[PDB]
Amino acid sequence: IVPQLQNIVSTVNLGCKLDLKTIALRARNAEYNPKRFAAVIMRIREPRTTALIFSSGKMVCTGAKSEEQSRLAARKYARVVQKLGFPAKFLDFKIQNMVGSCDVKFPIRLEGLVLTHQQFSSYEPELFPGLIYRMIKPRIVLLIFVSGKVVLTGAKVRAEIYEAFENIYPILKGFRK
Amino acid sequence: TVPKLYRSVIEDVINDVRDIFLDDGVDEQVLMELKTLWENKLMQSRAVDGFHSEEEEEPLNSEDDVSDEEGQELFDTENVVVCQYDKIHRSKNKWKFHLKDGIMNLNGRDYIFSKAIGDAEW
Amino acid sequence: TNYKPVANHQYNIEYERKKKEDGKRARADKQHVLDMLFSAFEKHQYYNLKDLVDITKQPVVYLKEILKEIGVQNVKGIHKNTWELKPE
Amino acid sequence: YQLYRNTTLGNSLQESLDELIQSQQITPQLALQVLLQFDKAINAALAQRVRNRVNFRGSLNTYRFCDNVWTFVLNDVEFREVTELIKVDKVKIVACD
Amino acid sequence: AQLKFFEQLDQIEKQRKDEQEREILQLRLKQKAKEMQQQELAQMRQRDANLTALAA
Amino acid sequence: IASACLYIACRQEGVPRTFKEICAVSRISKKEIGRCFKLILKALETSVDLITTGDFMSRFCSNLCLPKQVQMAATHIARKAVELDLVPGRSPISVAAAAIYMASQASAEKRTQKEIGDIAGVADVTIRQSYRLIYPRAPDLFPTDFKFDTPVDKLPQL
Amino acid sequence: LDLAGPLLAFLFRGMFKNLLKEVRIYAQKFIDRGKDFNLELAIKTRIIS
Amino acid sequence: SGSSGYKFGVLAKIVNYMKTRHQRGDTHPLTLDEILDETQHLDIGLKQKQWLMTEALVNNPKIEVIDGKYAFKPKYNVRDKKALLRLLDQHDQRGLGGILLEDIEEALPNSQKAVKALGDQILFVNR
Amino acid sequence: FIQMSVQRIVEDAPPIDLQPPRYLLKFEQIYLSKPTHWERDGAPSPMMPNEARLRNLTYSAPLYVDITKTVIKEGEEQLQTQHQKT
């Protein structure tokens, strides 16, 4: 089974002062609420991404299907800010979070995973139906369900998400109902 | 009842500001002239019927386009709707609008809603 | 004598109120806040800092800096310093 | 709200007051006092006049939020009022808390 | 305008009546407080008015 | 922190208590107590053990004033259901409430599902869905040594 | 000659006033927050027992 | 509310603006009407403008008017930012009680002033 | 004392008001129960005096009261609550 990326989270700093009120009014499809957040929210129809705009100029992009799409959307948002008269540069661009979702296609026993790895997986039925599994070797959190859908999130790179799923795949096959 | 409501508003405003005109020392006849002018303009427009009328960082520009034009939004031909929003709800790209006490000018006609529900996709 | 609520009723009432109303806002329009401070100073020589916090949505820390520029807090001999407009 | 001042009835009143100021028939700033009184009267009338309850389907083009005021650009939106059905290519809706 | 000038004097006579209520007790204080309550609402309205002009 | 630590202590003791009961005596919401409980688990490096349905069954049946034999039958139904996995990935309290309702209806001392739901703390609709899932195998779930005032075939379905 | 029940009643009255004082302190804190008030939280079971 | 004209604190804001332009370094003589145009308070009404000149300007205790145009009430002395060493040379006046609060607004930022003070013989003691 | 004095002491209590919304609490009917001992599971068992000596249990009976809560918000609106057997 191959994990499919759902969200690409990237932080890029414009490096110039931004006026939030001016950006919200001038930019199309821009909503800013000061009390809720200091982030001006701007979205573009072609790529489904959310942009957070701050006086520092750091911009966060979330919900991008692919890493290339996230960078392209950030470039489009930055150039729109440049059109508003605030200079925009790409500085310290990095992907903080990559989320991958895949289905094993077989039922998995949550109780068996807890018994073998109480330290690795902490699961409480009342708090949430899905088991929560954390593996030391890959830096990501794995969600295991009776359906068998697996969600991996918090990995810096796509390769880590794939590696974690492959590492736990024999364990899931062992607990297959 | 939208024309009747507008005529009632005209009478209430003139009566309330009559005292202010007296305090200023402006003649009551001038206030009556203002009331006549306000009624006359509505007759000229013909919009509302009136009882009185009846009487690399550097090449950002290289990725050009991909932005909707700001000028398109304002043409002055847009239908004008004035309303009060109880709340606005957005899920994903879908938008839900809750409005109250709103008058909508559509097809050169005025429609008032006690409450309205609008579903739109962005 | 044992009951099983998911959350305490009083806690949920506060949580709904917190979402419905945000106490203060962000630090913006300092000049507009300065004009509001001038209006309070015109109304009374000394205005309590807590009363000024209710008047302006500017954060107490930012508001104190604006107050410091146009006014000095005065004990009045009763301690409990109350901000008053500078004679200078 | 001062949004109601920007209406065909409100605009005609504002211009008529300006004509009186131009002739010097009314002292300057008298128009502002009339507009403040107009806002109180219009808000009260809107609050308790009663109206039809209706629902509409549409497509959203642009959204603007500032000063707790929602501005929406609506394209190809169908409005249904009772039996009547309204079709307009372009409509602008402004909502004030 | 001469008539307007003694019209103001009648308002001053009302202020003298206001001094009589002040010694008895609150009308002058109530009127000033009401204006201040209106001013806070007016400041919010003034910000909204600029937006309506900018929008259309 | 105190409420979250108490929930972990119940797991260490081997006699778990419902989170909702901790919420009843604590101003803090269940979500915040649960988030703190994860942080305390990391701090004390405590292993996680699944909660036991039987401990919950005794207290709820005592509140209902159900006879001990009815309580034993309900516990047997819940234990059999989890092994059969008739209900998939379902919290024990919801399964226990459905088992109690089935046992009460068969017994002379019938208890309404909504009254059991208030005592359990689970939603009445959730119990009804759980009861429907275990209803086809309900005769198998019941212990062989039981007396039925009402037959499983004639048992009311909710 | 004092009977056992009146001696118990006098002490119980002292426990009851202590319980009422605890309710007032808890209520005052809840009133200051203004979120709401719960009498069951205000009463202390331990003082009487 | 005693005596007030239009928006409250307008007279105090006008005095503050007169100080602000001097700190900015752009200095021009301004009539009361000219200040109103600069602050966008020109439409304050005839009565309010008359009240400011007749009573509000006179009311300020430290207000100084050179002749045709009024001068800033807070600081009569020009913010030259020069001859501080000469003030230091006379210890009888203790530098004329010079305050860093007055400085840093005359024409330079605090960061530049802090580097200059350390390099210069002049030193600052703050009780 | 148990049947009448305990009821009289709660009945002869001034209402406690905290405010400015005011919350008023009144202690009325008293409810008493046969002595019960709470086990680790939390299921109550009727206390037996011979058993109490063996396990060092304390022989005591649970006490309950009816509390009426009335709150005025200063809006001329009163909310009434009927807590029973607290």
Coordinates of N, CA and C in Angstrom, one line a residue, chain C residues 31 34-35 38-40 42-43 69-70 86-88, chain H residues 3-4 8-9 12-13 16 51 61-62 73-75:
Chain C
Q31 N -3.0 55.8 17.1 CA -3.5 57.2 17.1 C -4.9 57.2 17.5
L34 N -5.1 56.8 21.1 CA -4.6 58.0 21.8 C -5.7 59.0 21.9
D35 N -6.5 59.2 20.8 CA -7.7 60.1 20.8 C -8.7 59.7 21.8
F38 N -7.4 60.8 25.1 CA -7.6 62.2 25.3 C -9.0 62.5 25.7
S39 N -10.0 61.8 25.1 CA -11.4 62.0 25.5 C -11.7 61.6 26.9
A40 N -11.1 60.5 27.4 CA -11.2 60.2 28.9 C -10.6 61.2 29.7
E42 N -10.1 64.4 29.0 CA -11.0 65.6 29.0 C -12.1 65.4 30.0
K43 N -12.7 64.3 30.0 CA -13.9 64.0 30.9 C -13.5 64.1 32.4
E69 N 3.3 58.1 27.6 CA 3.7 59.2 26.7 C 2.9 60.5 27.1
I70 N 1.6 60.3 27.3 CA 0.7 61.5 27.5 C 0.4 61.7 29.0
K86 N -0.4 64.6 32.1 CA 0.8 65.4 32.5 C 0.4 66.9 32.5
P87 N 0.9 67.7 33.6 CA 0.7 69.1 33.6 C 1.5 69.7 32.4
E88 N 2.7 69.2 32.2 CA 3.5 69.7 31.0 C 2.8 69.4 29.7
Chain H
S3 N -15.8 73.1 29.9 CA -15.8 73.7 28.6 C -15.1 72.8 27.6
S4 N -15.7 72.3 26.5 CA -15.1 71.4 25.5 C -15.6 71.8 24.1
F8 N -13.3 65.5 22.1 CA -12.6 65.8 23.4 C -11.1 65.6 23.2
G9 N -10.3 66.5 23.8 CA -8.8 66.3 23.8 C -8.2 66.9 22.5
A12 N -5.4 69.4 23.2 CA -4.2 68.7 23.7 C -3.5 68.0 22.6
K13 N -4.3 67.4 21.7 CA -3.7 66.7 20.5 C -3.0 67.7 19.6
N16 N 0.3 68.4 21.1 CA 1.1 67.2 20.9 C 1.7 67.1 19.5
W51 N -13.6 79.1 19.9 CA -13.4 78.7 21.4 C -12.0 78.3 21.6
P61 N -1.2 76.2 30.7 CA -0.3 76.9 31.5 C 1.1 77.2 30.9
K62 N 1.7 76.3 30.2 CA 3.1 76.5 29.6 C 3.1 76.9 28.2
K73 N 3.9 73.8 23.7 CA 3.8 74.0 25.2 C 4.9 73.2 25.9
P74 N 5.1 71.9 25.6 CA 6.1 71.1 26.5 C 7.5 71.6 26.5
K75 N 8.1 72.0 25.4 CA 9.6 72.3 25.5 C 9.8 73.7 24.8

